[PDB]
Structures are given as structure tokens and as C-alpha cells.
Write a structure and sequence with these properties.
Keywords (chain D): Coiled coil, Mitochondrion, Ribonucleoprotein, Ribosomal protein, Transit peptide
Radius of gyration of chain F: 32 Å
Protein name (chain A): Small ribosomal subunit protein mS31
Structural class of chain F: mainly alpha
Strand content of chain F: under 5%
Oligomer: part of a larger assembly
Chains: A mainly alpha (131), B mainly alpha (101), C mainly alpha (154), D alpha+beta (198), E mainly alpha (66), F mainly alpha (100), G alpha+beta (138), H alpha/beta (132)
Family (chain A): Belongs to the mitochondrion-specific ribosomal protein mS31 family.
Helix content of chain C: 40-55%
Shape of chain C: extended
Distance between the termini of chain C: 76 Å
Largest sheet of chain C: none
Subcellular location (chain A): Mitochondrion
Bound molecules: magnesium ion
Structural class of chain C: mainly alpha
Radius of gyration of chain C: 25 Å
Subcellular location (chain D): Mitochondrion
Helix content of chain F: 40-55%
Largest sheet of chain F: none
Strand content of chain C: under 5%
Number of helices of chain F: 5
Number of strands of chain F: 0
Distance between the termini of chain F: 83 Å
Largest interface: D-G, 49 and 51 residues
Number of helices of chain C: 5
């Protein structure tokens, strides 16, 4: 038999429709209540058991160190002074937030980076040098 | 199609408060510390004060979702005492019964 | 000392239901499961057996017609995990520009007339239409014969 | 006027007393008087009256019945589910033997509720328990480890409890609990120069 | 409501047939199936937490019921 | 009120357990709390407090016009409004009120 | 007479990966009706015995939450109606079962969880020490 | 005098069902609950959402099966399944009941994003518990 299949063969209308004629030959009404649950489970309507409260929710495949170690995102900020102390509290709080994705946590940090850039003049008056 | 105009105003307050939550949280963080300069915190005070009044979460009122009654509401079911009792007394609230002891 | 941990067993998400289903047989006092198990609603003849299911399917079609006609009423998704098969279907093309990538949309939706019209206009303008797309247009016309596939209601 | 429709006799009248009942109620289903061949009555009776019959009885409809879980059905169900199970190691006869070979305990909780959303924020929590006796800790390391963990360590039981719930997922809180156990173990073995001032 | 003697006679025929059905459901011998087993089987199959026992599901001999 | 050993042992545990490492007063610790939780306005109980009354009213109104839902209340209102016209108590045209 | 001749059995594949070991499964069910928990206890315990799982059962103390509401729509403050929600508990404690056995048993008893009954299953997994922790690098 | 959910005495001619004949203090004593779900158990969430859904389903079914319902609905939730159990009359033709079952199950499944099933029990007439 054909040894290497055409995995990337396109689904032409002729091939998609013929596959529907092969699903009609085994099309029969549900015989009992177990078959209705099986059908709902295949269709995705019924929860899969045993129950997993995280079913269908992976947080973008993020690892734990992406949520808890956020100092790699403060490289654009000053290394010392009040702006560093303030951002260590923000990242400390974001590292304890299980209701935010890594994407949303970075957005918070990026907002402060831009906010402090617009306030460079005000910060220079106070002897703080943000970039 | 909300119960009344007062429920409609709270719906808008909840929608606007949700839209400005992140912005208000970030500005407030600048005001809620003794680390940053006062010159910077004084500017943050003005910025959060300039945001729309209906973005402020203290203006949200927990009204009955079926009658818009602003008081006598049970938070767990979001119903006024009158509406809650109507359902409870007809056996339509799972597990809820009259208490005698 | 050493302990031998047993090897893990794996099965499909429906395997347990399929095992439980194997333990039961057809109930001979009952009509097929598709019918309402009620003496007044159970089919009493081969004619009612056919017509009762057609009436139930008609009700499903009326609901789907309404769901797809007024999708904004059925767009609030409170299900976790998401159920793609319980959302409204959108049968209209959302690309209104005249180009090849907009024709491919009308071909996937199987719009024979719109795809032909979009193909003519695209051709008169003199823009190049790829071969793969031209064939994908023939597969649609050659299958349905330059006729529109059946729909629920226009 | 055409003839009105006659309801058929209840199919309980066709059931044999030696039938396979699990086939009648294979899955959880509401009480059906026409299908349950029992003269069961429910309802507080009126004075010099009987409890209401099953036909049209809403009180019997309100009950989460177990007609689909008769002892005959449960025993047949489990005979088919034996092929899905694996054998517990015989060597692990007692809890003390499990602790010897498996010193770490990982606790997680799953929550089954009724509704459209399976999500529950309590499910992310992970609890890791280990006994410091199980770890290769010298006198200095055990003393430093106990000070670092603080109240996480219980002297009575000698068990270190690390509860992690700061990540969105349980797999992340599990990897973080193992990470904490690893950095605590290696820092306990490191000796700083300020420690000489104890 | 007055229950004619013929009605009670047919209510007893239903209880005896249902008694064998209930015994078959629980996989027990229909001959040695007692009223205590009936009450136990009905409490399992139709669990009711109603505080008043008189309002709970019951499958008793018509003599006892009516 | 801590020895140098205890102060540095507590600062080391904070580093390992991802706590605040710099000395921070109670006022500045509110920043940590603010970003450790969702704001009240972002909680689902807050922004989804009400059911979408537009959806429910519009859906059932549409189902009534389709003949698949009988709104007894609306039918009652329609009969009262019908009998008020025969009684002469009809709603005026906007701009054509009794005051003109 | 009209019986199936041969039955297709669900495919259970034995893997090459070792199975999870659960020291304990604590299945805590909560409900408003004690009789429903009694029937579920009987079902769950009988299911465990047939599968060869060691199971113990006990009943944690019930919780009754009471609250007071005004009886009248307007005034009459001294007249109240009091309501309660009763939460009753049953705890199935299973021991020394593999991860595959826990998946089958929990799926079987979770699918048959009566309406109005919630379940909190706490699973205690046995793990070996991470390899990095076995010896000090220093 | 208490009024809540009390069918008041008449001249002995008003037929009441078992549910209608029992005042609220008999709830959990002589009568059960018309909806069963986990939202009102201690430590459980989403009681507010389950309650709104129940109020809608009762109104939806009242107007979808007009004149057909012979008693209050019984609402059961297991997992993500929603079961609606209704006692109906035997006046509508069986074809109309199958149309409405197919229609209602489909529409409610898409509205609340869960598999919804409707279980109908027919009675020749409203079951009378007593004549008040
Ligand atoms: Mg307020
Ligand atoms: Mg009074």
C-alpha cells in the first residue's frame, strides 16, 4: 500500500463531501442514555471526567518562573533609587497575583516604564535620573 | 430594557469602572507609597482626579438585579429581600428553607 | 530495598462510558430512546415513529434558524471549557475588499454566485487570480452545478 | 370531530418480574411512573387519606433517585471497570513503608460543582509535605533550614509544609513548590560569613 | 374518597407484583423479601431528606396504607 | 529588635520565598497588595453583577413575534392599550401634546 | 433471543510510563439532604469494594447558615422571617490506590453525583525526592 | 396574618396541587425543592447565576408551553447538564410536543452554553391534592 501519505493534501469539496457520505452510512439514532453522553463528550458539550477545574485553560503554556521572577523586565529602569524600590514592590505584588497572565503582568510593568519616561523632567528636579 | 433608569446608570458605571480599572490601579499605586517624590505624587493626584467620575468604583451600587431595589439586597443572590423571599417561599431556591431552632 | 511501580494505563475520554454501556442491553418494553418515554408521547405506529422524529428535528431546525438569524442573543459564553459547537454560525463573508484573498472566503462559504461575481470583477480589473484558487472555484461550481446549496430560509 | 388520542398503557405492565432492570434505567434519569414497576407513593396524606400515587407525583420527580445504581447494576458496572485499574505495589504494605520510599507528599484538590463553568480558583493550590529526617541535612543545615522556613516547619511532627498558590495553574504551583524545596535545601547547606555572628 | 373492597383487592395484586420487581432490582430472593427490606430498598432508590417521615416515599401493603 | 544574625536570616528567607527584600513601611506595602489582587471593578461579581436585561427582553420579544413564546404580560398590556383607544385615551404624537 | 454476538471492548492501553501513586483520596461530598448522601455513600462504598479499593467513611459535622430578613415590604421592623441553608457532609477516605484506579473510580462516582451534591476530592500523591536535593553541591 | 405562598381557604371548591397546598414552613418538611444545584451549599459559588437561570427557564417554559404545564418545573443540574422535568397535559397533539421539545432543548443549550434536556410527563388532568 502507499508507503508515504500525502499529509498536506488539500481538502477539496469533492473529498470533504465524500467524507460526509461515509458518516451517513453509520448514522443511527441514539440507542440509550450512555450513547447520548458519549456523543456529547465527543462533541465537547459534556464535561470530561474525572473533573479537572483547569480543563481547557493553559495560561499560554507559561512556566512558574515567568509568573514569579519578573526582575528581567526591570532592566530598562534605574538600578538604584526610589524608582527601583517602587518597581520591586510592583513586581513583588505581580509575582503574587494568580489572576493575571504573564502578558498582563508585563503590560503593568511597561506602563510604568513609559510613565516614568514622560516624567523625566519632574524626576530630574528631584535628583532622580530615569534613562 | 433594564428595570429602571437607575439600574441603567449603575450598568454604565460598572462598564466604565471596568474599562478604567487598570489605569486607575496604576495611577493609585504611585499615590499609595512614601517612596516616590511628592512632585511626582502630586501629579498623579491630579491625573486620577481628572478621570471620568463614573470610573470611580465607590459609585457602583449593588441593586437588586430583578427589581433595582438599592437596599435590602443579599449579595450572594443579588436579590432584594422581597424578591429573595418570593422565590424561597415557593421552594425555587435550592437548599433554602425556613429556619426554626 | 526497591519497589516496582505499576505501569500507567491510558484510555480515551469516552472509554469509561463505553465500558458501562457494554453492561446494558436493549430494553424490550420501551420504544427507541429518541422518543419521549411517556405513554401519551410514545409513538403508537410506524407512521408516528417517523413523524414524531421529523417534528422534533423541525423544532431543532427552527431553533437553529433563530440562533443564526439573531446571533447577538446567543453570544454570551458562560461555558468553561469553551464549547465551539454551541455558538452561532456566520454564513456571510466578512471581507468586502475586491481581491484574491476575499474570493477564497466566498469559496469556503460555498457562495456560488458571489464567488463568480467576485471572480468576474476581479478579472475585469486585470488583477492576477492564482491557479489553486481558480481550481477551488471550479470544484465548487462543478459540485453544485452553478446552483446555490440549500439553506434554512432566505 | 376526529377521535381524541388515547394514552397507551404504562409499559410497566409488559415488564417481567425477572427482567434485567439495569437496561430500564441505564443512566441517571428522572422518575418515570410509566417505566418504574413499583406501587410507590409519596406525599403527606390528607386526614383519612393515603399518600398520592406516583402518576403526576411531583414529589417523586423532585427526588434524585438511584434507580440507575441498583446493587445489580453497580456490580456489573465494576466488572467492566476492572480492566481500567492498576495494582498497588505489594511492597508498600504500611504508611511507614511508603514514607521510607516516597518521602514527599503532594496534596491537590478537585472541585465538582453543577453549572456551565468547571473553573474553581481553589483548585490551583498545591501543598508539599516532607519530613526533614528524610532529607540529607547535617546539623548546620537542619538548623538553618528551620529558621528559614519559620512556621512552615512543625517541630512536633518534623514536617515541612510548603503551600503554593500564587500561580494561575496547579502544574505551575507544583513546579514552584519543588523549586522552593530545592533552593531551601541548597541554601541550608551554604554557609555565609555573617552566620559566624550567631 | 371511599375505597371499595374490589379496589383494595387489586391494590394487593399490584403490591405483590411490585414486591417481586423491587426484589429483582436489588438482586435479592423474592420469596424471603420482607417489609423491612422493602423500606430499606425504597429509602435507597428514592432518598428523601424530608423531616416528616409520613411525607417520604413508601411502598407498603395496602392494608397498612389505606 | 532583632540580632544581626536574625535580621539577615529573615532577609534571606524573603529572597527565597519571593517576599519584599528592601525595608518597606506599611504605607508602601499597599503597592504590593494593589498588584497582588484584581481590582474590585475587574471582579466578575462587579462587572457581571446584572444579567444582560437587553438580551433577555430582546430575545423574548423576538420569540413572541416569531410565534414561539406567549407573553401573557405583553398580551395583557396590548389589550389594555387597545381598549384605551376606543375610550379616546390615546398617546399623543410627540410635539402635538395637549400643550402646544 | 436478540442478543449481541460479540461486543467491542473499549481500548485500554498499558503505557511505558510509570503510574502515579496516591497515598489517600479524601472525597468530601456536600448536600442539603442526608438521605441522598446515605444513598451516595452506599453506592460509592459498594463501588470501591467491587474494585478492591480500601475505603473508610465518616460524617463531618453539619453546617447550618442562618440569616434574617424583614417580613413586611414596608416598616414593621420587629417582624422578621429567618432562613437557613443546611450543608451535610459525607467523607469517603480511600487509601493505597494507583493513579489509573483513581481515574476510573472518580470518573464513575463523579458522573453519578446526584443533583444538589457537590464533591471536593483531595488527592495526596506520593513522590520521590528530586535528584538535585539528594546531595549538596557545596 | 402571613400571606407568603399560602393558598387561602375558599368554599371547598378550589382544587390545589400538592405543591400549592403547602405553605413555606413545610419546605424541607413535607415538600422538597423545585430546583437542585450546588450553588447554595457552604463554600460553593455562582448561586446568583444559577438563580437567574432558574427564573428564566420557568418563564421560558411557561410561555413556550402555554396552557400545557400542569405543575411547577423541576430543575436538575448535574455537572454541566441541565435537566428540565415538567408535568404537562394531554391536550396538545404529540407532534407539537416533539417540535417544542426539539426547539426548546436546542435554543436553551445555545443560550446557556450547556447540554439541556427536557423530560415531559403527561397527565390527563391537573392532579388535585385537596379542595380548599
Ligand atoms: Mg456604596
Ligand atoms: Mg407575625
Amino acid at each position: 500500500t502507499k508507503e508515504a501519505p500525502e499529509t498536506d493534501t488539500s481538502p477539496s469539496l469533492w473529498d470533504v463531501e465524500f467524507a460526509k457520505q461515509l458518516a451517513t452510512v453509520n448514522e443511527q439514532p441514539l440507542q440509550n442514555g450512555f450513547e447520548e453522553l458519549i456523543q456529547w463528550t465527543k462533541e465537547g458539550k459534556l464535561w470530561e471526567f474525572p473533573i479537572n477545574n483547569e480543563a481547557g485553560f493553559d495560561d499560554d503554556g507559561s512556566e512558574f518562573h515567568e509568573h514569579i521572577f519578573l526582575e528581567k523586565h526591570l532592566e530598562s529602569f534605574p538600578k538604584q533609587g526610589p524608582i527601583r524600590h517602587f518597581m520591586e514592590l510592583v513586581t513583588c505584588g505581580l509575582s503574587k497575583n494568580p489572576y493575571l497572565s504573564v502578558k498582563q503582568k508585563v503590560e503593568h510593568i511597561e506602563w510604568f516604564r513609559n510613565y516614568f519616561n514622560e516624567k523625566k523632567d519632574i524626576l530630574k528636579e528631584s535628583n532622580i535620573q530615569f534613562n | 430594557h433594564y428595570v429602571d433608569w437607575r439600574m441603567w446608570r449603575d450598568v454604565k458605571r460598572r462598564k466604565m469602572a471596568y474599562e478604567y480599572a487598570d489605569e486607575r490601579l496604576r495611577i493609585n499605586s504611585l499615590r499609595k507609597n512614601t517612596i516616590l517624590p511628592k512632585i511626582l505624587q502630586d501629579v498623579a493626584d491630579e491625573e486620577i482626579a481628572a478621570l471620568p467620575r463614573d470610573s470611580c468604583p465607590v459609585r457602583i451600587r449593588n441593586r437588586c438585579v430583578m427589581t433595582s431595589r438599592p437596599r435590602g439586597v443579599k449579595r450572594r443572590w443579588r436579590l432584594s429581600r422581597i424578591v429573595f423571599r418570593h422565590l424561597a417561599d415557593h421552594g425555587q431556591l435550592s437548599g433554602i428553607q425556613r429556619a426554626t431552632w | 530495598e526497591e519497589v516496582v511501580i505499576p505501569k500507567k494505563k491510558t484510555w480515551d475520554k469516552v472509554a469509561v462510558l463505553q465500558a458501562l454501556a457494554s453492561t446494558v442491553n436493549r430494553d424490550t418494553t420501551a420504544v427507541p430512546y429518541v422518543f419521549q418515554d411517556d405513554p401519551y408521547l410514545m409513538p403508537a405506529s410506524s407512521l408516528e415513529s417517523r413523524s414524531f422524529l421529523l417534528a422534533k428535528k423541525s423544532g431543532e431546525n427552527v431553533a437553529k434558524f433563530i440562533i443564526n438569524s439573531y446571533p447577538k442573543y446567543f453570544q454570551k459564553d458562560i461555558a468553561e471549557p469553551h464549547i465551539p459547537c454551541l455558538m452561532p454560525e456566520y454564513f456571510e463573508p466578512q471581507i468586502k475588499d475586491i481581491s484574491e484573498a476575499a474570493l477564497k472566503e466566498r469559496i469556503e462559504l460555498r457562495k456560488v454566485k458571489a464567488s463568480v461575481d467576485m471572480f468576474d470583477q476581479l478579472l475585469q480589473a486585470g488583477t492576477t487570480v492564482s491557479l489553486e484558487t481558480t481550481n477551488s472555484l471550479l470544484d465548487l461550481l462543478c459540485y453544485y452545478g452553478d446552483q446555490e446549496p440549500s439553506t434554512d430560509y432566505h | 370531530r376526529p377521535p381524541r388520542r388515547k394514552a397507551l398503557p404504562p409499559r410497566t405492565e409488559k415488564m417481567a418480574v425477572d427482567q434485567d432492570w439495569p437496561s430500564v434505567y441505564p443512566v441517571a434519569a428522572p422518575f418515570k411512573p410509566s417505566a418504574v414497576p413499583l406501587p410507590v407513593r409519596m406525599g403527606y396524606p390528607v386526614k383519612k387519606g393515603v399518600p398520592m400515587a406516583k402518576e403526576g407525583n411531583l414529589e417523586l420527580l423532585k427526588i434524585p433517585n438511584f434507580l440507575h445504581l441498583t446493587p445489580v447494576a453497580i456490580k456489573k458496572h465494576c466488572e467492566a471497570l476492572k480492566d481500567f485499574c492498576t495494582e498497588w505495589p505489594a511492597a508498600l504494605d504500611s504508611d511507614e513503608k511508603c514514607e521510607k520510599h516516597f518521602p514527599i507528599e503532594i496534596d491537590s484538590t478537585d472541585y465538582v460543582s453543577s453549572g456551565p463553568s468547571v473553573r474553581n480558583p481553589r483548585a490551583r493550590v498545591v501543598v508539599l509535605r516532607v519530613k526533614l529526617s528524610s532529607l540529607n541535612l547535617d546539623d548546620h543545615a537542619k538548623k538553618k533550614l528551620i529558621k528559614l522556613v519559620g512556621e512552615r516547619y512543625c517541630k512536633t511532627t518534623d514536617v515541612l509544609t510548603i503551600k503554593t498558590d500564587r500561580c494561575p495553574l496547579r502544574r505551575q504551583n507544583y513546579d514552584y513548590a519543588v523549586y522552593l524545596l530545592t533552593v531551601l535545601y541548597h541554601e541550608s547547606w551554604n554557609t555565609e560569613e555573617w552566620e559566624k555572628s550567631k | 374518597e371511599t375505597y371499595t373492597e374490589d379496589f383494595i383487592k387489586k391494590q394487593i395484586e399490584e403490591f405483590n407484583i411490585g414486591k417481586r420487581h423491587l426484589a429483582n432490582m436489588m438482586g435479592e430472593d423474592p420469596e424471603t423479601f420482607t417489609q423491612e427490606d422493602i423500606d430499606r430498598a425504597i429509602a435507597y432508590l428514592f432518598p428523601s431528606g424530608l423531616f416528616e417521615k409520613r411525607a417520604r416515599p413508601v411502598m407498603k401493603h395496602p392494608e397498612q396504607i389505606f | 529588635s532583632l540580632s544581626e544574625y536574625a535580621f539577615r536570616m529573615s532577609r534571606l528567607s524573603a529572597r527565597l520565598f519571593g517576599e519584599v527584600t528592601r525595608p518597606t513601611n506599611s504605607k508602601s506595602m499597599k503597592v504590593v497588595k494593589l498588584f497582588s489582587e484584581l481590582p474590585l471593578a475587574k471582579k466578575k461579581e462587579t462587572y457581571d453583577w446584572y444579567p444582560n436585561h437587553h438580551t433577555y427582553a430582546e430575545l423574548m420579544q423576538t420569540l413572541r413575534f416569531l410565534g414561539l413564546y406567549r407573553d401573557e404580560h405583553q398580551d395583557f398590556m396590548d389589550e389594555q392599550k387597545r381598549l384605551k383607544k376606543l375610550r379616546g385615551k390615546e398617546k399623543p404624537k410627540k410635539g402635538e401634546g395637549k400643550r402646544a | 433471543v436478540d442478543v449481541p454476538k460479540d461486543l467491542t471492548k473499549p481500548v485500554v492501553t498499558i503505557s511505558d510510563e510509570p503510574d502515579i501513586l496516591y497515598k489517600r483520596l479524601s472525597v468530601l461530598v456536600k448536600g442539603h439532604d442526608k438521605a441522598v448522601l446515605d444513598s451516595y455513600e452506599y453506592f460509592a462504598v459498594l463501588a470501591a469494594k467491587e474494585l478492591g479499593i480500601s475505603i473508610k467513611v465518616h460524617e463531618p459535622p453539619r453546617k447550618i447558615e442562618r440569616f434574617t430578613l424583614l417580613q413586611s415590604v414596608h416598616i414593621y421592623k420587629k417582624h422578621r422571617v429567618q432562613y437557613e441553608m443546611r450543608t451535610l457532609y459525607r467523607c469517603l477516605e480511600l487509601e493505597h490506590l494507583t493513579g489509573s484506579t483513581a481515574d476510573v473510580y472518580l470518573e464513575y462516582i463523579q458522573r453519578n453525583l446526584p443533583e444538589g451534591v457537590a464533591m471536593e476530592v483531595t488527592k495526596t500523591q506520593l513522590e520521590q525526592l528530586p535528584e538535585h536535593i539528594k546531595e549538596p553541591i557545596w | 396574618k402571613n400571606r407568603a405562598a399560602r393558598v387561602r381557604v375558599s368554599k371547598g371548591d378550589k382544587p390545589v396541587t400538592y405543591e400549592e397546598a403547602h405553605a413555606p414552613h413545610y419546605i424541607a418538611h413535607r415538600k422538597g425543592w423545585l430546583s437542585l444545584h450546588t450553588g447554595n451549599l457552604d463554600g460553593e459559588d455562582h448561586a446568583a447565576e444559577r438563580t437567574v437561570e432558574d427564573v428564566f427557564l420557568r418563564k421560558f417554559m411557561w410561555g413556550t408551553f402555554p396552557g400545557c404545564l400542569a405543575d411547577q418545573l423541576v430543575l436538575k443540574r448535574r455537572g454541566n447538564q441541565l435537566e428540565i422535568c415538567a408535568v404537562v397535559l394531554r391536550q396538545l397533539s404529540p407532534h407539537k410536543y416533539y417540535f417544542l421539545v426539539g426547539y426548546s432543548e436546542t435554543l436553551l443549550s445555545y443560550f446557556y452554553k450547556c447540554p439541556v434536556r427536557l423530560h415531559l410527563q403527561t397527565v390527563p388532568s391537573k392532579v388535585v391534592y385537596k379542595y380548599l
